[PDB]
Design a protein around this ligand. Structure first.
Ligand SMILES: N#Cc1c(NC(=O)c2ccccc2F)sc2c1CCCC2
Length: 319
């Protein structure tokens, strides 16, 4: 037997003997930290439970399985290993994904007071990864702090590959479903950046109705040429919400929320606030591109059926 089993709270992790001393570290299914005897270093292990239980799970599991192996960048997860304990296609039940062990989630980092030095290096790293995915034909469209991990030395990796549930970081074009470009991902990075400053979710809501409301109060009702690109029915809903004027960015992010103890930090606040207002733009036509955000002075400092899916996945776990 090359495997063994151990409980981590009703979740049985049956894993290769190389992986030792399991300990839970997250569930946004189930993920463990472990020592890997062969590599003499620490790894994270995530177990997909019967990832082929429906079209949804199976389509994502399969796509993420393929790409994670297929895509190669320092700011994007990669697998050190993939395995299933089950020996046959018939008995096949679970997939385990193994990655280099990271120390924290982005939720955790946003809770800290952070300097511009670390906040800007984290943003720089999201743009690089997001940049990379785009160059590969992957527009993510679902960036959030929970699918982004961090090491103590502030190196950052994106954990998943997007759409092909936390909704706060989704762009207007996703909230309204209207067809998107690469810079749909820039909205999300703008939401993340803002939360880092404000320490509250920029656009919360029970659903997309409340959500869009939060967007228009703070940013104001968008201009006419933006509306002209919304389909008849959604366009009607948008134009008919009470129209707001929309706070400016100094009001949205008062100096209070920035270090003002030196000139460096004063300049850095100004630049930060300037980038937030290019990212947090409702109309994609007028929202900043990834390549440009990487140029910003705040940033540039760092330059088909349950049966069928089962088999498709299995092959890929075999491979
Ligand atoms: N490393 C790491 C890590 C997580 N990893 C994963 O979710 C994961 C995703 C895909 C493949 C493997 C894997 F461990 S989840 C999580 C962490 C670090 C602590 C916060 C929660």
């Amino acid at each position: 037997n090359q495997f063994y089993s151990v409980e981590v709270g009703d979740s049985t992790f049956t894993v290769l003997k190389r992986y030792q001393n399991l300990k839970p570290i997250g569930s946004g299914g189930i993920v463990c930290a472990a020592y890997d005897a062969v590599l003499d270093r620490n790894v994270a292990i995530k177990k997909l439970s019967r990832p082929f239980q429906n079209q949804t799970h199976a389509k994502r599991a399969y796509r993420e399985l393929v790409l994670m192996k297929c895509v190669n960048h320092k700011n994007i997860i990669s697998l050190l290993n993939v395995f299933t304990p089950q020996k046959t296609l018939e008995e096949f039940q679970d997939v385990y994904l193994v990655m280099e062990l990271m120390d924290a989630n982005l939720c955790q980092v946003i809770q800290m007071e952070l300097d511009h030095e670390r906040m800007s290096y984290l943003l720089y790293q999201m743009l690089c990864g997001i940049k990379h995915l785009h160059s590969a034909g992957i527009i993510h469209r679902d960036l959030k702090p929970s699918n982004i991990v961090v090491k103590s030395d502030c190196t950052l990796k994106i954990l998943d590959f997007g759409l092909a549930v936390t909704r706060y970081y989704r762009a207007p074009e996703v909230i309204l479903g209207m067809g998107y470009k690469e810079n749909v991902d820039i909205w999300s990075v703008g939401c993340i950046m803002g939360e880092m400053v404000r320490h509250k979710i920029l656009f919360p809501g029970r659903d997309y109705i409340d959500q869009w409301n939060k967007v228009i109060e703070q940013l104001g009702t968008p201009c006419p040429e933006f509306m002209k690109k919304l389909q008849p029915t959604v366009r009607n809903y948008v134009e008919n919400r009470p129209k707001y004027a929309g706070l400016t960015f100094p009001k949205l992010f008062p100096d209070s929320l920035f270090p003002a103890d030196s000139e460096h930090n004063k300049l850095k606040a100004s630049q930060a606030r300037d980038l937030l207002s290019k990212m947090l733009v409702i109309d994609p036509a007028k929202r900043i591109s990834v390549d440009d955000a990487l140029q910003h002075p705040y940033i540039n400092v760092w330059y088909h059926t349950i049966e069928e899916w089962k088999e498709l996945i299995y092959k890929e776990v075999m491979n």
